[PDB]
Paper text:
In this Article, we present a high-resolution structure of SC I + [name] from [name] (mung bean) from a biochemically active preparation. This structure contains the full complement of subunits for plant CI including [name] (B14.7), previously missing fragments from [name] and [name], and a newly assigned CI subunit (NDUP9). Our cryoEM image processing resulted in two initial reconstructions of SC I + [name] containing the full complement of subunits (‘bridged’ SC I + [name]) at 3.3 Å and 3.6 Å resolution (class 1 and class 2, respectively). Further improvement to the CIII2 map quality was achieved by subsequent focused refinement around the MPP domains. These focused refined maps were combined into a composite map with nominal resolution of 3.2–3.6 Å. The mung bean SC I + [name] map showed three interfaces between CI and CIII2: (1) a matrix site formed between [name] (CI), MPP-β (CIII2) and MPP-α (CIII2), (2) an IMS site formed between NDUP9 (CI), [name] (CI) and [name] (CIII2) and (3) a membrane site between [name] (CI) and [name] (CIII2). Contrary to T. thermophila’s SC I + [name], where the CI bridge domain provides an extensive SC interface, [name]’s CI bridge domain did not directly participate in the formation of this supercomplex. In contrast, in SC I + [name], the MPP-α subunit in the CIII2 protomer closest to CI was a different isoform (corresponding to gene LOC106765382), as revealed by the better fit of this protein to the density of SC I + [name]. While the MPP-β isoforms were the same as those in SC [name] + IV, the helix containing the catalytic glutamate (Glu217) was partially disordered in both protomers in SC I + [name]. This leads to an inability to coordinate the catalytic Zn2+, which would render the MPP domain non-functional. Overall, we found that [name] CI within SC I + [name] showed an intermediate loop configuration, a non-canonical A/D transition and very limited differences in the angle between CI’s arms in the presence of the bridge domain.
Author numbering:
A (entry chain A7): 65 to 127
B (entry chain S8): 112 to 222
C (entry chain V1): 59 to 488
D (entry chain S1): 58 to 299
E (entry chain S4): 50 to 141
F (entry chain S3): 2 to 95
G (entry chain V2): 27 to 248
H (entry chain S6): 31 to 101
The structure:
């Protein structure tokens, strides 16, 4: 009994696309401003095998 | 298959929602105003060699006119036999009306 | 503090019609005294007197009459310009214009002349509702008497002003009370109100500049002009000042129409001139202060509320036509508001979508909730529908239909809660 | 910001060009041209049911409501004249709520007969409901019903679908020149047509079905022959007249 | 393609199409369907949509087939007013 | 999500060939010139912090309106850093 | 059925309708009351005059006659007569009884008055009695709300002359029955309020205002 | 007639037009009806409201059943 679609219109309620034309001066400004640290590098998605028995999770029953 | 109302009139108005949604375009329909002003289809054919048996028409029907019946053992020796039309669809609906009605009740519960 | 007018300060001295309402009675009571001097004084002078008299529109809008008259074009263009006097009262609860026309018609005619002079109007049209036929006959006889005596026509008085007054009657439509709908009906079309990019002061009755003014304001114009704007501003308080005649109706002991000073307490108005509520003040449940347009008020607010434009607007309500309809504990306010919604649905013109369909939806919802066949979220939806109808409709009749339901939801919500819960319990039992 | 439908503005004189703001972007507009056409020049279209460019202006549907700054109530775009330095907005919550409410009120009494309605895929009520209106319906009570009218061998009338926009009442008055159609009645139930049995007869009578947004007036020879999406349209000229 | 006369929406205008004039459709003897023999029966109306007439001309010149551009017709906006809707007739 | 190596690339990648970039939740997008696409993909595949060492696919899109109708799109994945990247260029028939 | 014309051996366009001589004089006066080029403004008075002359209802013949007089297409007159409530387009009795029913009267006994009328006459809403003397209905608020429940009697017996749209206020069901009996017998009851203890639109018993003799205002120097 | 012979060639069984003409009109007390197709609204057609002011029977336009007002 509280139909109101302009608030739950998930299809059309999106912000407009923003465009910025960066020139040579802006590119040089960003290049000089930016710097790299040991903590700013992308994190690694690391994973490894464990060699775990089949009956280890819940005794093989729980599922 | 095509059904009918309990009175006996065709259940299918010519809304043309069948071929608007039929992904394989296996349904062709033409219509005109009847003698008493009712909107009825004067031509309604379905290719059983082009139908992908997907049920889009039977769920797009506003009046539950077209239904994909429970029958599946209708293998024919000729492609022309497999090319259905309105009279064959209507006689299929009349023949399988009771089972189609039972299935339609059970599934209209699930809707 | 306010109220208790004396017979000398009362404007409509023949309200109950105990004396002769014709020309001889009018002259005896003090009508057409110095109309020649008033017309000679000047249009700008009349407009200034109205502006500084504090007079406000008595038809419900409450707009200042002086400013509304000054909105007319000063330079006489090719178009003749017109005065129109709204005698078409159909809002439930109010019958003041009926008494004014029936018992003081010469006051109305002199007011038409004065307003036309002050607004540079060539002619005046008095739009009587079709139901009033005896009042129309009385006003016709008064107009013929005035024309024979020379009070109207080519020479209204010793002044050289040209003024002609005609009266046109409707055919039983509530929308025809609206200004633009009334102009359309007077044109001979259906009583469908216009929009408001063209104001009536620019393109009105026939595309000519016309001004639509209420009977009470136009009739009290000559009296306040003759007695001084200071005298009129003495009564009442602040902006809303003067003498207003209230029709007290409903479950009161002796319902009556009485002219009283503005800003009188509602309780004092009810229990001094009318007589009081049927079973005492404690028996009072809800009062609609104006006509059916404005939202109602419970007993709690009516204890101290003041009958004027501002206090009734300080609370979520309005003065409107200042015709109070009272309801004691015996009746059911839900059924009363359901009947009001039915009236509004019946009387909507049906040109604009939110009022053509929304009024019917409100009536059906109110009929359902009278028995109790509704839900809590359905009363919330009713409030939402009221809000949807209110601001998106061509004229103020959409507001007039939305307001009573909104007020009932705001004030008497627990009654609806109890009715819905009781009906749910009965349905579960059955 | 090209004008809507590539439309070209007609300036009576270059001196008269007021600068009106639509959705933040200002545009130049003639003096007397309304807010709806101002936004059309700006490039945004507003839903409309009782407005036709050739016909007159009426606020029958009350759906072209936009929020103009310094105004308590939503204003009708098709009727409010554009003033200099006026800030018009169409994507505000006020305008969206107004459109949704007006669509709900329009659809509360519309019959559930779109599949038999010949305006399937070309019905302004359907497209505007799917674009601006809500996806649900709060109405479940008794609808209204209207008996059909016989208006000749060309116009088939289903008056249950009529939204009473008076677009055809004033079409016969202004363009056709024969005053037979009319809005008669008062309130929620008001019918349209002729009081007496009067078949509408005019050379331009075929245009009445064209301007009807809903499937109220339809071509009788093309009653139920085909839908819109099926038909392929070729732009040609006529040879019956000169 | 011009705006449809049935409805006033203007979101399907401004696009340009190549109209392969392929009208060689007949009726199937067996089932009465609309047969064809031209590969370009529906591609121009279905898949080929161009941003502008210049783009359509460039495509036609690139692909070599002769073309003829049809001038598109555009509505003209004129001032309308509800005040002019209520005009005053002259004296009798 | 995982817009880490995309930003790191734009920080470290030479700016000569980055014709345009798009930061989207539908997929980070690089659009470059056809001359430098091989060098750009070689940099991304070999760099230690943008290791998109698996090529998901190559797609084509037809845009008849544009002068260069064909759009060649490369969807790449970095399993070491767990993120998808997109690099596209424009090519015509000849 | 109430917003379109269904042909009957009466009330069809083939029958001719025209005003009598006094009605023609009244039509001339009404037209003279309005500008010559705006004679359509007189459609409501002309329709009212036609309704009084034709026994209380407007036939399509009178509709067309009025449209011809005001020089407009008949559809405009049809619209005008259909829009307004007072214009009856179906046959009613010689006496049209109308009850209010609107809330200020409904909370005072309007529903009881209407049900008493229905029981006494034996007919339902908007249905003429089988004899044809009476026809009872209701409509929206009709003024004099403060004067208790009320009924209006439209008297279409003598025609255009002798037509009375009389009011009857402060009525009880017994008083309404008595008024109906008097109207059926042929004596015209005194219209107005029915309470002998009050003045028209005044408090019951003595008045509380305007007790003294009215005097001219002191006035103002002008 | 022509339409029935156009979509059907059996010309031995009863066409739906004849059956729907043979089913009698349905007399209803009220001025408006709700036409649903059968006893189960969910298994019929979209609800159609029919006005019955005209003397002649009114076809439902869905499952046409010719409802007629009582009096
Ligand atoms: C639904 C509705 C009912 C109205 N009823 C009346 C009425 O009974 N009397 C009246 O004078 N004006 C009526 N009007 C019009 C306004 O009151 C209008 O402001 C008035 O004609 C002129 O204002 P005034 O009070 O300054 O004279 C109505 C308007 C609407 C929208
Ligand atoms: S079930 Fe068959 S006929 Fe129906 S939509 Fe699917 S493919 Fe088409
Ligand atoms: S969807 Fe149903 S009613 Fe419509 S054409 Fe198909 S079978 Fe007929
Ligand atoms: S708000 Fe709309 S429907 Fe209501 S009376 Fe006014 S114009 Fe007519
Ligand atoms: S015009 Fe109305 S009845 Fe026809 S398909 Fe559109 S929304 Fe439905
Ligand atoms: S019939 Fe169509 S064009 Fe005419 S008023 Fe109704 S909806 Fe509008
Ligand atoms: S199009 Fe403007 S109100 Fe209808
Ligand atoms: S409420 Fe009955 S006369 Fe006004
Ligand atoms: Zn049905």
């Amino acid at each position: 009994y509280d139909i109101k679609y302009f608030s739950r219109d998930q299809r059309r309620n999106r912000p407009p696309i923003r465009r910025t034309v960066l020139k040579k001066a802006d590119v040089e400004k960003l290049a000089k401003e930016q710097t790299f640290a040991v903590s700013d590098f992308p994190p690694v998605y690391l994973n490894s095998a464990v060699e775990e028995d089949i009956n280890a999770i819940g005794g093989g029953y729980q599922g | 298959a095509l059904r009918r109302y309990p009175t006996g009139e065709e259940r299918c108005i010519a809304c043309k929602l069948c071929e608007a949604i039929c992904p394989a375009q296996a349904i062709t329909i033409e219509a005109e105003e009847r003698e008493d002003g009712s909107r009825r289809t004067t031509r309604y054919d379905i290719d059983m060699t082009k139908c992908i048996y997907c049920g889009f028409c039977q769920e797009a029907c506003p009046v539950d006119a077209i239904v994909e019946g429970p029958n599946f053992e209708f293998a024919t020796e000729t492609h022309e036999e497999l090319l259905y039309d309105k009279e064959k669809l209507l006689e299929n609906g009349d023949r399988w009306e009771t089972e189609i009605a039972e299935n339609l009740r059970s599934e209209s519960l699930y809707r | 503090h306010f109220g208790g007018l004396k017979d000398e300060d009362r404007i409509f001295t023949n309200l109950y019609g105990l004396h002769d309402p014709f020309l001889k009675g009018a002259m005896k009571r003090g009508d057409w005294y110095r109309t020649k001097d008033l017309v000679i004084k000047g249009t700008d002078w009349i407009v200034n007197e109205m502006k500084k008299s504090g007079l406000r529109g008595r038809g419900g809008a409450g707009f200042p009459s002086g400013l509304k008259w000054s909105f007319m074009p000063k330079v006489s263009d090719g178009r003749p310009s017109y005065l129109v006097v709204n005698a078409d009262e159909s809002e439930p609860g109010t019958c003041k214009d009926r008494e004014i026309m029936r018992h003081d018609p010469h006051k109305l005619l002199e007011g038409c002349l004065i307003a036309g002079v002050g607004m540079r109007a060539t002619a005046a049209y008095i739009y009587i509702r079709g139901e009033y036929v005896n009042e129309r006959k009385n006003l016709e006889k008064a107009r013929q008497e005035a024309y024979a005596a020379g009070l109207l026509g080519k020479n209204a008085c010793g002044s050289g002003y040209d003024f002609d007054v005609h009266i046109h009657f409707g055919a039983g439509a509530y929308i025809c009370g609206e200004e633009t709908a009334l102009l359309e009906s007077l044109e001979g079309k259906q009583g469908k109100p216009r929009l408001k990019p063209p104001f009536p002061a620019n393109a009105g009755l026939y595309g000519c500049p016309t001004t639509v003014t209420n009977v009470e304001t136009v009739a009290v114009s000559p009296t306040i002009l003759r007695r001084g704007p200071e005298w009129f501003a003495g009564f009442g308080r602040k902006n809303n000042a003067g003498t207003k005649l209230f029709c007290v109706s409903g479950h009161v002991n002796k319902p009556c129409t009485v002219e009283e000073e503005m800003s009188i307490p509602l309780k004092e108005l009810i229990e001094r001139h009318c007589g009081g509520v049927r079973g005492g003040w404690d028996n009072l449940l809800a009062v609609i202060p104006g006509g059916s347009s404005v939202p109602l008020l419970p007993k709690s607010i009516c204890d101290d509320v003041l009958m004027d434009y501002d206090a009734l607007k300080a609370v979520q309500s309005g003065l409107g036509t200042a015709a109070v309809i009272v309801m004691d504990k015996s009746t059911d306010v839900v059924d009363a508001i359901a009947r009001l919604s039915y009236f509004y649905k019946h009387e909507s013109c049906g040109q604009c979508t939110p009022c053509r369909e929304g009024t019917g939806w409100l009536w059906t919802i109110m009929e359902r909730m009278k028995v109790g066949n509704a839900k809590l979220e359905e009363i919330d939806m009713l409030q939402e529908l009221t809000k949807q109808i209110e601001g998106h409709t061509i004229c103020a009749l959409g507001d007039a239909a939305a307001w009573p339901v909104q007020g009932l939801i705001r004030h008497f919500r627990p009654e609806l809660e109890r009715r819905i819960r009781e009906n749910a319990e009965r349905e579960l039992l059955q | 910001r090209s004008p809507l439908a590539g439309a070209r503005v007609h300036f009576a004189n270059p001196d008269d060009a007021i600068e009106v703001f639509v959705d933040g972007y200002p545009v130049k507009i003639p003096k007397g041209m309304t807010v709806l056409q101002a936004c059309e020049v700006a490039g945004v279209d507003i839903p409309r049911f009782c407005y036709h460019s050739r016909l007159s202006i009426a606020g029958n549907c009350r759906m072209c409501l936009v929020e103009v700054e310094k105004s308590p109530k939503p204003v009708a775009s098709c009727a409010m004249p554009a003033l200099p330095g006026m800030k018009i907005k169409t994507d505000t919550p006020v305008a969206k709520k107004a459109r949704e409410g007006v669509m709900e009120f329009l659809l509360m009494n519309h019959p559930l007969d779109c599949p038999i309605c010949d305006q399937g895929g070309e019905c302004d009520l359907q497209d505007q409901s799917m674009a601006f209106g809500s996806d649900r319906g709060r109405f479940t009570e008794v609808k209204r019903s209207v008996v059909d009218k016989n208006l000749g061998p060309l116009v088939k009338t289903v008056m249950t679908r009529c939204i009473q926009c008076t677009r055809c009442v004033r079409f016969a008055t202004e363009v056709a020149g024969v005053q037979d159609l009319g809005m008669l009645g008062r309130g929620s139930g008001e019918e349209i047509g002729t009081y007496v049995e009067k078949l509408l007869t005019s050379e331009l009578s075929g245009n009445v079905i064209d301007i009807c947004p809903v499937g109220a007036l339809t071509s009788k020879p093309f009653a139920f022959k085909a839908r819109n999406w099926e038909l392929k349209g070729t732009e040609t000229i006529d040879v019956t007249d000169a | 393609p011009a705006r449809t006369a049935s409805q006033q929406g203007s979101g399907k205008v401004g696009r340009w199409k190549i109209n392969f004039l392929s009208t060689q459709k007949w009726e199937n003897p067996l089932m009465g369907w609309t047969s064809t023999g031209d590969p370009y029966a529906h591609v121009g109306d279905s898949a080929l949509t161009f941003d502008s007439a210049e783009a359509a001309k460039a495509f036609a010149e690139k692909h070599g087939w002769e073309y003829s551009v049809k001038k598109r017709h555009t509505p003209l906006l004129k001032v309308k007013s509800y005040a002019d809707n209520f005009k005053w007739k002259g004296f009798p | 999500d995982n817009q880490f190596i995309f930003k790191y690339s734009w920080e470290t990648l030479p700016k000569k060939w980055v014709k345009k970039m798009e930061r989207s939740e539908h997929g980070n997008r690089f659009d470059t010139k056809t001359d430098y696409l091989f060098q750009l993909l070689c940099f991304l595949k070999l760099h230690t912090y943008t290791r998109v060492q698996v090529l998901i696919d190559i797609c084509g899109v037809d845009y008849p309106s544009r002068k260069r109708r064909f759009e060649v799109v490369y969807n790449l994945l970095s399993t070491r850093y767990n993120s998808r990247i997109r690099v596209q260029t424009s090519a015509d028939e000849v | 059925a109430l917003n379109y014309h269904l042909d009957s051996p009466d009330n069809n366009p083939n029958l001719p309708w025209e005003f009598t001589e006094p009605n023609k004089a009244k039509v001339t006066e009404i037209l003279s009351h309005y500008p010559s080029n705006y004679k359509q403004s007189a459609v409501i008075p002309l329709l009212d005059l036609a309704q009084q002359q034709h026994g209380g209802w407007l036939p399509v013949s009178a509709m067309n006659a009025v449209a011809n007089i005001i020089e407009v297409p008949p559809i405009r007159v049809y619209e005008v007569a259909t829009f307004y409530s007072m214009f009856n387009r179906a046959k009613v009795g010689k006496y049209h009884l109308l009850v209010c029913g609107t809330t200020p009267c409904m909370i005072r006994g309007s529903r009881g008055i209407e049900e008493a009328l229905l029981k006494h006459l034996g007919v339902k809403r908007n249905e003429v009695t089988p004899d044809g003397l009476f026809s009872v209905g209701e409509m929206e608020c009709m003024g004099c709300c403060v004067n208790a429940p009320m009924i209006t009697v439209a008297d279409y017996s003598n025609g255009s002359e002798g037509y009375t749209y009389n009011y009857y206020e402060d009525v009880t069901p017994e008083k309404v029955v008595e008024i109906v009996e008097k109207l059926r017998k042929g004596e015209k009851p005194p219209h107005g309020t029915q309470n002998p203890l009050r003045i028209r639109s005044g408090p019951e018993g003595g008045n509380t205002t305007l007790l003294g003799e009215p005097k001219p205002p002191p006035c103002r120097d002008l | 007639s022509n339409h029935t012979a156009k979509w059907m060639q059996d010309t031995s069984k009863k066409s739906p037009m004849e059956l729907i003409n043979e089913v009698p009109p349905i007399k209803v007390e009220g001025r408006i009806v709700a036409c649903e197709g059968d006893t189960n609204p969910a298994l019929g057609h979209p609800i159609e409201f029919i006005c019955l002011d005209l003397p002649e029977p009114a076809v439902c336009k869905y499952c046409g059943l010719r409802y007629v007002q009582d009096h």
